[PDB]
């Protein structure tokens, strides 16, 4: 299969904030068929990101995909309270669909 | 428009069968693909394998094949998933989800990506 690489696997981040999510692939990922989905808790995953950085009707311009052949990055502008979930990419350039294991985007706290 | 709607949670002995179901309305009439993804407690989402009920063609991934089971009605755009005998490690959200087809038309090979998902069924082995 293609092994897709999310790290780091969680990030602390505040309200505002812009963050930036990786994944690699272990081989390249054709046509980049690329997919990312934003998780909340309780919740089914939502689909953010199409074809890299084809972005489905309803979905908010601040989500943005970009990236090509094994490397590609979701950003997420003006972090909202709604964005702290889990996020999973996906490639589809292979009949074998595999996920990412996942990044935790979650609200920096100080310890 | 397209919405999709899951059987209830499950409670299952070791052992035992469950099917789990995916009924799908709204969208256009073509040969989307109803896929089944596992997400076992804390843990992702893997990819089991799908359905096009339109064509009665189904797709497993390898890893799952030994011990599933995908079928669908066409008639009632009802997709289903046994899992033939149960272990504890089988406890996990079972999602069902869409793939679209691309392109003009009716008729063609499902897009990889998953627009629309079902709300889960938690099945649950006992024991």
């Known amino acids: 299969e293609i092994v897709l690489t999310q790290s780091p696997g969680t990030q602390s981040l505040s309200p505002g904030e812009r963050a930036t999510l990786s994944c690699r692939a272990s081989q390249s990922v054709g046509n980049n068929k690329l997919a990312w989905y934003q998780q909340r808790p309780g919740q089914a995953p939502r689909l953010l990101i199409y074809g890299a950085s084809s972005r489905p009707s309803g979905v908010a311009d601040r989500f943005s995909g970009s990236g090509s052949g094994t490397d590609f990055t979701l950003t997420i502008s003006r972090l909202e309270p709604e964005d702290f979930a889990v996020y999973y990419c996906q490639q589809y350039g292979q009949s074998l669909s595999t996920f990412g294991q996942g990044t935790k985007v979650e609200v920096k706290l100080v310890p | 428009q397209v919405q999709l709607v899951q059987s209830g949670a499950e409670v299952k002995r070791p052992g035992s069968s469950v099917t789990v179901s995916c009924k799908a309305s709204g969208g256009s009439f073509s040969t989307y693909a109803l896929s089944w993804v596992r997400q076992a407690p804390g843990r992702g989402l893997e990819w089991m394998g799908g359905?096009?009920?339109?064509?009665?063609?189904?797709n497993y991934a390898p890893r799952f094949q030994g011990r599933i089971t995908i079928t669908a009605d066409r008639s009632t755009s009802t997709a289903y998933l046994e899992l033939n005998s149960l272990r504890p490690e089988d406890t996990a959200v079972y999602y069902c989800?869409?793939?679209?087809?691309?392109?003009?038309?009716?008729?063609?090979?499902?897009?990889?990506?998953?627009?629309?998902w079902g709300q889960g069924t938690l099945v649950t082995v006992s024991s």
């Open positions: 989800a869409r793939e679209g087809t691309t392109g003009w038309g009716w008729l063609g090979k499902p897009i990889g990506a998953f627009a629309h």
């Open positions: 359905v096009i009920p339109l064509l009665t063609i189904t």
